[PDB]
Every structure is written in C-alpha cells, then in structure tokens.
Amino acid sequence: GEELFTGVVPILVELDGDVNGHKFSVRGEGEGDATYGKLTLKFISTTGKLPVPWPTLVTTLVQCFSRYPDHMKRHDFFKSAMPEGYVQERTISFKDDGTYKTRAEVKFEGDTLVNRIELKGIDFKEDGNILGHKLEYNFNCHNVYITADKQKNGIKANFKIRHNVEDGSVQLADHYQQNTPIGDGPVLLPDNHYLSTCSVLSKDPNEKRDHMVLLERVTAAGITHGM
Structure with missing residues (x-):
C-alpha cells in the first residue's frame, strides 16, 4: 500500500452533486506526491455555473497523499487500504444553513488514484452564504483530527472548517x-x-x-517520540 506512493501518482476526481435540487458535476485532474504531502489538481464544472461556492467542495474533492513522518507511518490508514481503497463518508453541517452528505470511493484504477464522489445538500437557505455565493475564494489551514474505529475496521475524523465570508464574518x-x-x-x-x-x-x-485550481500540503502530526 505505502509502496504505491513512493513517486508522483496521477489523480482523477469525479463528483456528482445535488444541493436543494440543483444538480451539478465536477471533474478534477492532477497529480500527488505523498513523500512531501503535496498535490496539484484542476477541477472544472461540466454542468455550467456551480450552485455552490468552490470552497464548500474543497474538503469533499484524497488524504492518502498525506505526508506521514517516519515515526508515524504505522498510523497511515489511508495508504494501507490501497490499491483496493476505502469509502469516505462525511456529514458537513454548515452553521445556520444546510448540510452536505457525501460518499466517496478513493481507490487505484491502474496507476491512477481515483476519487469518485456523490454529494447531497439539504436545507440550504437561498440567501445563505452558500447558495448566495457569499464566501471568499480562499481557504484557511485546518487540522483534521483522526481517531481509530476498530469496530468498522476503519477511522473517524472530526474538524471544523471556517470559510471567510465577504462581510468579514x-x-x-x-x-x-x-x-x-x-x-x-x-x-x-x-x-x-x-x-x-x-x-x-x-x-x-x-x-x-x-473551475478551481488547487494546491494542497498535508502533514500528519501529533504522535509522540523520544522516550
């Protein structure tokens, strides 16, 4: 599994979305370098203007490319599931607004790491920051906290994304x-x-x-060392 990421790996992302009945599709292409936790991807809409801002889809649109330090490589669940891959499911609750429900299969198809996603949004307000396109075109750094889920033979994760709004909120x-x-x-x-x-x-x-061009740097951390 870890051997599959020793070099640059091509990436393909496909997402079919549906938010408040507004259907849309996104396809991304690029490459990742897990040795340095880096990836560059270019996503484009195939259905015209997106009904939601691009920053809301960033976390949904491949944590297997995370750079794990050498003292933490035994804690890399994402690479260990490859090439067969893993199912990534999320519930994204925007405060005072709608909720995303996503389900994705991240796996190798030949030499390519593929992320196929189905997304569903509900209860989004028309004048809200999402449907109203009130979010700025940027993204802050966040820490994704991972915990083991032995009963399901997998992991859970929890974190709060903070999208900058144009009014300063x-x-x-x-x-x-x-x-x-x-x-x-x-x-x-x-x-x-x-x-x-x-x-x-x-x-x-x-x-x-x-479209949205995205570059990402991920580094695992939080595991002790040195007696």
Missing part, C-alpha cells in the same frame, strides 16, 4: 468523517493524531469553464 462547517476499507486485507488502525492541512485556491487564466 466566518461560515462554520462542522465535518464528521468516516472511512472504511473496500478490500479485506489488513489495514493500519492509528492512534489519535491529526493532519495539518493547507490549501491555496487559484484560477487558470486560460480556463473558460467555472
């Missing part, structure tokens, strides 16, 4: 995450730790479609 989005392996091979169940994640959003000047 903050749109909270509580993330509740569950990952379970697809295959039957043994997986690594980690001790408590977290992923320091940072993201930079940009735009391709030659891209005409509604």
